[PDB]
Structures are given as structure tokens and as C-alpha cells.
Structure 1
Amino acid sequence: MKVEIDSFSGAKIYPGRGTLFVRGDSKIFRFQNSKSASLFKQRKNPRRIAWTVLFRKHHKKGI
């Protein structure tokens, strides 16, 4: 087996836990949770969301 990375939060997705999405352009996204999923459908930016790994690494926290 393997573990993966939420498009939004960038989190380990242990098997089965979480949702998957396949846009018409064949981009396969994965979501650990409906929180991330709903934000994605809202077309939010994780780099702006604070608790996200992208914001974390863009503001240079936990270096």
C-alpha cells in the first residue's frame, strides 16, 4: 500500500480515508476531508489559508 498527499492541505491519505476528484482535464485531486473538498469547490487558495502546509512553507515556519 501507499499513502498520499491532499492537494489542499498536503496531508497523508491513508487508504480509503478521504475522497478523490477527477476533473474533466484528467487532473486527479485527493482530499483527506470534506473541509478541504468544500474549500476546493469554493476555489480558495491554500497559500492564503493559514493552517495549510503551503502557507506554512510560504511563510517559512517549521524550517
Structure 2
Amino acid sequence: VKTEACSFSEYRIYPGRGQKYIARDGKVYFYLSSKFASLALQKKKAAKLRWTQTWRRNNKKT
């Protein structure tokens, strides 16, 4: 089976749980739940959001 990758998050997406959010621009935005979209819709940055793999890439700790 094929699972996609999230926009803010990076883990695979399992159908049967999800939601979808779209902004005014018409761009597609995919995540996993309201907690996986809350700070995204609240204009936050994944470079400062510590607890994802984006901060790892922005602090070179791989």
C-alpha cells in the first residue's frame, strides 16, 4: 500500500483518521489531525517548532 507525506509533518498518512485543510490561495495542504494543523494555521514556524524533524534539519543534528 502507498502512503503519502504530510506538509508540516513527515510521517506517512493512514486513511481512516485524517482531515484536509486548504488556504485561500488554492494550494493543497495535507496533515494528520487538528494538532497537526493547529500551529500551521496559527502562523508558526517549523524552524522553531522543536519537536519535529524540521528543527533537526535547521540545527544539523542528523
Q: How does the TM-score come out when normalised to structure 2?
A: 0.78
Can you give the 5+ residue segments of structure 1 that lack an aligned partner in the other structure? none
Match of 1:9? Answer: 9
Could you list the structure 1 runs, at least 4 aligned residues long, displaced by more than 4 angstroms after superposition. Answer: none
* Identity value in percent: 40
Match of 2:32? Answer: 32
Q: Give the number of equivalent residue pairs.
A: 62
What is the alpha-carbon distance in structure 1 between the residues aligned to residue 11 and residue 55 of structure 2? 14
Describe the shift of the 1:41–1:15 C-alpha distance in structure 2 as closer, same or farther (beyond 3 A). same
Match of 2:41? Answer: 41
Bigger share in helix: 1
Q: Shift of residue 38 of structure 1?
A: 0.9
Can you give the 5+ residue segments of structure 2 that lack an aligned partner in the other structure? none
Task: Tell me how large the CA RMSD over aligned residues is.
Answer: 1.6
Q: How does the TM-score come out when normalised to structure 1?
A: 0.77
What is the alpha-carbon distance in structure 2 between the residues aligned to residue 37 and residue 14 of structure 1? 16
